[PDB]
Amino acid sequence: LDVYVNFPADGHVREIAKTVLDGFDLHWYPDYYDAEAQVIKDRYVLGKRTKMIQAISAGVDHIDVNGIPENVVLCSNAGAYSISVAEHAFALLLAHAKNILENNELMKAGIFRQSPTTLLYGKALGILGYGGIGRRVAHLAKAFGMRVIAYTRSSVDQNVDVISESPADLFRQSDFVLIAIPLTDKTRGMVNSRLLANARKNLTIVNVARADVVSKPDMIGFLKERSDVWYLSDVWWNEPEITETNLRNAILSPHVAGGMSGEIMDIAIQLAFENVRNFFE
Amino acid sequence: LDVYVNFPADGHVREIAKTVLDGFDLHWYPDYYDAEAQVIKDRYVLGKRTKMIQAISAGVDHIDVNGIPENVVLCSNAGAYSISVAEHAFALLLAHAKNILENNELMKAGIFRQSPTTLLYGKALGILGYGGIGRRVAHLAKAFGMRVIAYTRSSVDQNVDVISESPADLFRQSDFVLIAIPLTDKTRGMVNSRLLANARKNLTIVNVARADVVSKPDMIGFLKERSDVWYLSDVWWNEPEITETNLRNAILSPHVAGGMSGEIMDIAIQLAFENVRNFFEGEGHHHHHH
């Protein structure tokens, strides 16, 4: 009983709460209410009844965690983003597999011209990393009837058919490759010329991690060198002053696979409230 | 336990066969053998032990069906087509939902500009016609977390959450509508000004059936009025004399959803053997019309 949303929320946000938190009493900013659960963006406000703090963002390292009594549980909203990013990765991947751009252009020029498309069913999707995004993607991949090879030291679930032991090993078994891996000193530029060299024919790389996991000058030369390999990416080096983006064999998006600087996805609000409800069963 | 492949097959085909049918004795043409199962292209050979005949093609109209004895089950192989079509439908669907074309155009000119996208998760996908394509589409939709509403001439499966009463009722409960219904006298011109008026705000329509199930002037007229509505189609009227094709709120493709012409997807042959294996566990696929 009792939830306090610590940020300005329109009627659509309020609507979702009515739906998801039926049986709870809602309180909205600015009418502070000391509740058992408070949903936040960046800042929180402690009280006597605080039990759980639900962030709506993907991570929580931007909030003041030290200020949180160990009697209170802080939760992220990572699941919402795993979901949105996966949809996005598949949108890029399918756009290329079905040559959606090239055919659309033709068809609108009044040209009817048939060409084969790549089918996902029966193919191998290699995945660098296996966090929430990788898991969601794997879940989609299996539904599409793909085989999943993953390179990670994390635990995997039943949607992973093969744990690869090296990136190169992963590359050799993949028709598609998704980069969904943390950026550390070991992964920075891990995607270089030597790794790319292992690329199956018609390999399609999909990047929804960080641009630095990939070597820029290496990917550009590699993409020039292997005209059959495509690089589809939601991330680019030095956003927003992106340069060297006019490539033929690439499809790009401006880092919108998930959370946006300007707003809150309905799904984020949705899953945050659901997580609150689940926390109390 | 006995399968006879009544046609020339290579090592590729053979490997697939040994993997899928590992635990069945295989025989290869032309070393005929009276097996329980026969895989064919155009001709079958009757035996004394024949129980099942598996065509590797989608249709059997070129097969002497009338000549098949009553106890022998004839199966066909059409799964690849609906699989392919469902994949093409989600490709159009997501292209629009993630503003793929527009963002890509901007990014390539060095213009970094964020904008929100549409998510499939949690949304209602209305399917018009629940056949092989609609079933496959619904399997993918459930995976994406979508809710599924179907309008059909009976028979839906477990991946359908709501059966509608009419096409207008379907449009009323849908954020996305997929058209995968056969073109007949009652479906011709089916999608009209009157039906479209039911479209929720921002409705996205995907057509993987036939252009004629849709009234051309009504759709083109509705897209001007109702500019939030998009029409994504893999089929256009007339074809190839396409006209009138340069619409803003539309993404189109040249009837390539199910492949091309007499394209044989490498995956068809595997599905054929798999159905043989499933048939003998007692679970062949149900032969749904597309």
Ligand SMILES: [K+]
């Ligand atoms: K997106």
Ligand SMILES: [K+]
């Ligand atoms: K296609």
